[PDB]
Design a binder for this molecule. Structure first.
Ligand SMILES: O[C@@H]1[C@@H](O)[C@H](O[C@@H]2CO[C@@H](O)[C@H](O)[C@H]2O)OC[C@H]1O
Ligand SMILES: O[C@@H]1[C@@H](O)[C@H](O)OC[C@H]1O
Ligand code: NA
Length: 330
């Protein structure tokens, strides 16, 4: 690694380079992080269930540790995430009797959570994924069903962004989602964000999760999505990048190691992806990987539990993979 290029330095004039972490991986992958990234995202510890597990009970310890690490190394921090249909405790939507609360009560709870969380990290966290995955991933409907939407109504996103803006008007607020480059969904995300911005809602950027495969989405689809979203005038962040060795239809669990073909195609894939990101450096301001080395990735258990994936630029021994060389040479 002595003579190895540093990711954040290579892309210094293009965009920040980030990694998703947790207290455990910060220790396990500390040197890689210190040598390559200038942005950090909490993989799980800033989600609702990990910040306010019970009403009035805030558990900022783990998030504080992540922020402390980032700040001690002059790394930016992306806040993830405030309002999402997943990883949110049941108490949030229920009353004493266990029945669903009213619109006003849920809005009060949403405002309280957002205000408390955002104000704590004001000045240390420069952006927040305010709304995560609200758009439907299947069907002809625009929005995915969720307790937030059911109880409050379809304007729940407008409210979330306004509450977050009030809490920290200097933060960049994002709508974050996956499968963001498939045409049908791209148009739903575009329509949603355009509608919000047309109402003056403080949504400053779109977060493209980029949980991609070797084949999907195509480079043309990625280019089209970047251009489509950029045309709204918002900032773009690639937020949870990883390149899975398995396509959606591939649920094999017996592969103990990736084939030389997988490794080679992944290298080509990462080179093509970063070449495209660099081309759009004027609108993309940050590229965060959902991890940093293959010794830790949520793809080991998703969508198939108990297997192994090799989605990042560094291997399990923290050594650069062929993908690393193609990525930094664009
Ligand atoms: O440890 C896992 C996390 O890595 C995972 O993170 C999510 C990945 O999918 C994205 O769409 C989400 O935004 C991101 O939070 O969440 C589940 C957890 O078990
Ligand atoms: O659970 C979600 C999964 O269904 C999607 O494919 O990727 C993002 C995850 O959060
Ligand atoms: Na840029």
């Amino acid at each position: 690694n002595s003579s190895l290029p540093s990711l954040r330095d290579v892309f210094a004039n293009d965009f920040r380079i980030g990694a998703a972490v947790n207290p455990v991986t910060i220790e396990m992958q500390k040197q890689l992080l210190i040598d390559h990234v200038n942005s950090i995202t909490a993989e799980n510890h800033m989600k609702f269930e990990h910040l306010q597990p019970e009403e009035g009970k805030f558990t900022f310890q783990e998030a504080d540790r992540i922020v402390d690490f980032a700040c001690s190394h002059r790394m930016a921090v992306r806040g993830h995430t405030l309002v999402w249909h997943n990883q949110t405790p049941d108490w949030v939507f229920q009353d004493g009797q266990g029945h669903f609360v009213s619109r006003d009560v849920l809005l009060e709870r949403m405002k309280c959570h957002i205000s408390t969380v955002v104000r704590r990290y004001k000045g240390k966290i420069y952006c927040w994924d305010v709304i995560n995955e609200a758009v439907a991933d299947e069907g002809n409907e625009l929005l995915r069903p969720s307790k937030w939407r059911q109880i409050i109504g379809d304007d729940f996103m407008e409210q979330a962004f306004l509450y977050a803006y009030e809490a920290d008007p200097d933060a960049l607020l994002f709508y974050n989602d996956y499968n963001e480059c498939f045409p049908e969904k791209r148009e739903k995300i575009f329509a949603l964000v355009k509608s919000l911005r047309d109402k003056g809602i403080p949504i400053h950027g779109i977060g493209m999760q980029a949980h991609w495969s070797l084949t999907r989405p195509s480079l043309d689809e990625i280019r089209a999505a970047i251009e489509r979203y950029a045309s709204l005038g918002v900032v773009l962040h690639i937020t949870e990048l990883d390149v899975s060795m398995f396509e959606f239809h591939d649920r094999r669990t017996d592969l103990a190691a990736p084939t030389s073909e997988m490794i080679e195609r992944q290298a080509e894939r990462y080179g093509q992806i970063f070449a495209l990101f660099k081309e759009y450096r004027d609108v993309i301001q940050s590229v965060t990987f959902w991890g940093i080395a293959d010794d830790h990735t949520w793809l080991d258990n998703f969508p198939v539990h108990g297997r192994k994936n090799w989605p990042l630029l560094f291997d399990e021994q923290h050594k650069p993979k062929p993908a690393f060389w193609r990525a930094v040479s664009v």
